[PDB]
Design a protein around this nucleic acid. Structure first.
Ligand SMILES: [Zn+2]
Lengths: 122, 55, 134, 97, 93, 137, 66
RNA sequence: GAGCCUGCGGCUUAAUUUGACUCAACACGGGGAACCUCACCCGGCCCGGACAAUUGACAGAUUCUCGAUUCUGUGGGUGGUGGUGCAUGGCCGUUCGUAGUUGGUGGAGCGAUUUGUCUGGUUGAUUCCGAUAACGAACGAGACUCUGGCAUGCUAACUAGUUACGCGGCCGGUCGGCGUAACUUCUUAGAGGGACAAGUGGCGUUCAGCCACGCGAGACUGAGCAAUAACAGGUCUGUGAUGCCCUUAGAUGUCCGGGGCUGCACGCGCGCCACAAUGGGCGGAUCAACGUGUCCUGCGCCGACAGGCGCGGGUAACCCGUUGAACCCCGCCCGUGAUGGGGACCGAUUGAAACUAUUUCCCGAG
């Protein structure tokens, strides 16, 4: 194949980790997205998703979870069935910076108050 | 017709033949290690890609 | 039956191999007394005229140097032929003379037996070198 | 003989799966060659900090560690398939040959 | 100025899987997912642009690419246009 | 070729190749400027015999060189006048015409690796000159 | 710049009041006591603590420290 | 100061390519200017076009043809290198990395507030000691993190090597190339040590420490992360960071060969020798290191140089590569001189395209 060198392999991996991170922070920011962890294994690429609320991300019979699996397999070039996405629910979200950063952002966009929302998360 | 004059300039080389893969800018590009992204945005994804400051 | 003692300058690492013969002092195959820096001729002959001619007649040492520069390799040779000789007097001969050769080298030049920790530090932005700032 | 290389980004996780691989291989009474320490490669990217032309020429020095470890093994491939599935951790890449 | 034969290939492919991914480049020759036809990138980003303005698809973006998802309302709009019975269901749903 | 003065050896070895007028000695390359970084032609009339002796000398030390790396050996500092002086290779044709001349004397062999080690005769004539210069001092 | 900080001053005093017979007038023996007794994620910090304990022990045997 | 290389004023006027002008403006915008893309400049093909009629066009600087859900079928869908960084965010510079901030309890004051957070010594340091209506802690500092200096001690290396005796020439000695025996000095990188004012002397509230000697790889250094905050100091021209406004189909996205690389004197930083004499020259000779490489380049034909052709390695401790680097070292030449000093100004290669020399080389040029 292209025979990807290691100096360009780690970079191509870190960009896939960064581009998938930004795509989900613009799409899953409502359900409490907190990050993803990848495990590059041949024929089985487990890409777990860390969210605060995972019951709504699933849907009636796993409707939204099928879209994201079909979303990255078409943008990054993954074969059919060669990629598997899993959703996990994190605990003690008060320790996650981006979880609390997006929390008060969705409340400050309404102009209610900047001192009540800040004290609410403190 | 128009398919022979629009975007007919060769894109083989030059500062405009390539752009950032994030900001689509064509200034301060970093063609090292296959990054292909502008310098002002590499600082934003330095930690996400793995270029942490071990220094 | 042999000791390999290295001499490290800025980057020149000279490893000397110690054997016994009859008056043969050569470095990298070439003779020690016919190296390009004719100016630094006594620096290579430095452990010869203060250590003892009769004590340096029955020693054959061949040095292999790599790295550094011209002057750095000169001080790496005298660092190799001196330490590798003392190591032979201390590992195969008694210490009564191994300390005698040790004392005459130290009283004349300490860097003849101790490498210099001085290296080229990293360059900083904003200036041409390490400290200067254009 | 099979030569499995270990290219990783973190040294703590590299030597862990490296030690866990040789222990899982030496227990099967197999001739394993010592872990060869390939020279590490750092990825320097000196980028200007400010996204403009205002500053005191302050640069940002980035790095990225690349550690490679070689592990040889002369044994049938049927006995090494399950061994490669027990020392897999995120951050280290496995290349079986 | 968009033909009709390509409109079926872009909408039926979006029907069998409710995901359509296209790269933001108005000078691309052929779409990667649309290889059997010569559909340009304009016929993929502009023909899908009319679906969002009418509320038929949801889009996402990572710096170069569109991530389209057929909304429940948009699938109903494509059930009659593509002439498929109400019993079949896409792969995503 | 060692154990003697390397500068006096090539000064003596060049006189050996001058007596045996069997080198190539091209018609035009022997009167042009040697390297690009040079300013004028070599002041010595028999410059081709001096570099010839130097070429066999480096092949005696390092083998498998070829004409590609020989020009790097004779490289120097090019004077740009106003731009910073840099390093450049010496000359490819001079190294090519001097290598093929020694192959005619059965001193150097050809190989896919490029300019293999000296022939048993090429190594033979070098030590003989090395012994004469040692006896002269 | 041979002045210790409060991290070294306080630790070197609380290690003596709890362990006085353990530490003597040798820095190297005192250095090994801090490995088993105290938990420090740094090695250079342990040498500063055990080094200052050696300085205190010369004062203790000389008289009552303040 | 001298010639010149770029940057910004000033001039020029199709437009000289805009912001930023003390520190903290002027090789800055990672901006070393052929096209790009360039925002500037002027000409044009153009619905490769829409939320509630042909695109063409050998004829030309107009004759006719074909496709058959997208044509002002009749007040808003949207683009952004267009303005506002004296509207903004994110980042960054600077104050200033100078060492400075905060809480509880207690004390003082009606109170805002104050004490703690200090006369002195010491320390780079609000670092300690000491003092003390304060006591006890936190942030910063330090610690920490990656670097470098040694470890003949360990863990391992045919993708790194030496060392032992055998086929290669000379005079078995003395030097090289070619093969899988022992282990690691040399090489690489893992673990763990080593250095703390520890030892002696001197000076010191004999505290804090400081100084000189030893022993010793060092009595030790170079990065990074860097507080309470502040500025109207920059960034709208780094972004699918953004509010608003201007401009929005004769277009404040392109693009075509391109125009924009522009001078009567003043300014910065920077390369280049002079005022050969410690230098230029010529020929020797001989030593690096980080870093990059799908492009790096190895061998063979042939140019004087710059090039060109076929054959190959390397996605890399594997090939370039033992990175034969320059200065330097050695021999000769030059010599009260604008000289052999000074290098200003007057055929190949890259690409679609170098004119206003892209670079490179040759001779002339001084
Ligand atoms: Zn970007």
């Amino acid at each position: 194949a292209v025979q990807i060198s290691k100096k360009r392999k780690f970079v191509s991996d870190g960009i896939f980790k960064a581009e998938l991170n930004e795509f989900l922070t613009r799409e899953l920011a409502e359900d409490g997205y907190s990050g993803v962890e990848v495990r590059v294994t041949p024929t089985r690429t487990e890409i777990i998703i860390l969210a605060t609320r995972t019951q709504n991300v699933l849907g009636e019979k796993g409707r939204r979870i099928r879209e994201l699996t079909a979303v990255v397999q078409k943008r990054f070039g993954f074969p059919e069935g060669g990629v598997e996405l899993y959703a996990e629910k994190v605990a003690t979200r008060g320790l996650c910076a981006i979880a609390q950063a997006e929390s008060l952002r969705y409340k400050l966009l309404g102009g209610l108050a900047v001192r009540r929302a800040c004290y609410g998360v403190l | 017709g128009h398919q022979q004059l629009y975007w007919s300039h060769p894109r083989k080389y030059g500062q405009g033949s390539r752009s950032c893969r994030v900001c689509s800018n064509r200034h301060g590009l970093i063609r090292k290690y296959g990054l292909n992204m502008c310098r002002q945005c590499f600082r934003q994804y330095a930690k996400d890609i793995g270029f942490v400051k071990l220094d | 039956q042999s000791v390999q003692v290295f001499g490290r300058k800025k980057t020149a690492t000279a490893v000397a191999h110690c054997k016994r013969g009859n008056g043969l002092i050569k470095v990298n195959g070439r003779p020690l007394e016919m190296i390009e820096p004719v100016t630094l001729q006594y620096k290579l002959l430095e452990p010869l005229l203060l250590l003892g001619k009769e004590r340096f007649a029955g020693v054959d040492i061949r040095v292999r140097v790599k790295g550094g520069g011209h002057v750095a390799q000169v001080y790496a040779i005298r660092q190799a032929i001196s330490k590798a000789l003392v190591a032979y007097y201390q590992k195969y001969v008694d210490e009564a003379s191994k300390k005698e050769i040790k004392d005459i080298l130290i009283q004349y030049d300490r860097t003849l037996l101790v490498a210099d920790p001085r290296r080229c530090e990293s360059k900083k932005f904003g200036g041409p070198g390490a400290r200067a700032r254009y | 003989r099979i030569r499995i290389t270990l290219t990783s980004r973190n040294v703590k996780s590299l030597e862990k799966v490296c030690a866990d691989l040789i222990r899982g291989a030496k227990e099967k009474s197999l001739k394993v060659k010592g872990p060869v320490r390939m020279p590490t490669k750092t990825l320097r990217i000196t980028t200007r900090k400010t996204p403009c032309g205002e500053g005191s020429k302050t640069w940002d020095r980035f790095q990225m560690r690349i550690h490679k470890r070689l592990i040889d093994l002369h044994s049938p491939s049927e006995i090494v398939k399950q061994i490669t599935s027990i020392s897999i951790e995120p951050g280290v890449e496995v290349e079986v040959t | 100025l968009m033909p009709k034969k390509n409109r079926i290939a872009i909408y039926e492919l979006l029907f069998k899987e409710g995901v359509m991914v296209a790269k933001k480049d108005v000078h691309l020759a052929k779409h990667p997912e649309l290889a059997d036809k010569n559909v340009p990138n304009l016929h993929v980003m502009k023909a899908m642009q009319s679906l969002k303005s009418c509320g038929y698809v949801k889009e996402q973006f990572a710096w170069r690419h569109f991530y389209w998802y057929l909304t429940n309302e948009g699938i109903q709009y494509l059930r009659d246009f593509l002439h498929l019975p109400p019993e079949i269901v896409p792969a995503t749903l | 070729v060692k154990d003697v003065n390397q500068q006096e050896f090539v000064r003596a070895l060049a006189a050996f190749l001058k007596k045996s007028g069997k080198l190539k000695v091209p018609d035009w390359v022997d009167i042009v400027k040697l390297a690009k970084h040079k300013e004028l032609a070599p002041c010595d009339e028999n410059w081709f015999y001096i570099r010839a002796a130097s070429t066999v000398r480096h092949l005696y030390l390092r083998g498998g060189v070829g004409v590609g790396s020989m020009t790097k050996i004779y490289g120097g500092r090019k004077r740009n006048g106003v731009c910073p002086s840099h390093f450049s290779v010496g000359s490819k044709n001079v190294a090519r015409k001097v290598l093929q001349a020694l192959e005619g004397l059965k001193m150097v062999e050809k190989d896919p690796n490029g300019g293999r080690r000296l022939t048993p005769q090429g190594t033979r004539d070098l030590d003989r000159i090395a012994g004469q210069v040692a006896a002269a001092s | 710049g041979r002045v210790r900080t409060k991290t070294v001053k306080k630790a070197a005093r609380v290690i003596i009041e709890k362990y006085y017979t353990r530490l003597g007038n040798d820095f190297h023996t005192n250095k090994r006591v801090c490995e088993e007794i105290a938990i420090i994620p740094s090695k250079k910090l342990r040498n500063k603590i055990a080094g200052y304990v050696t300085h205190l022990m010369k004062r203790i045997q000389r008289g009552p420290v303040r």
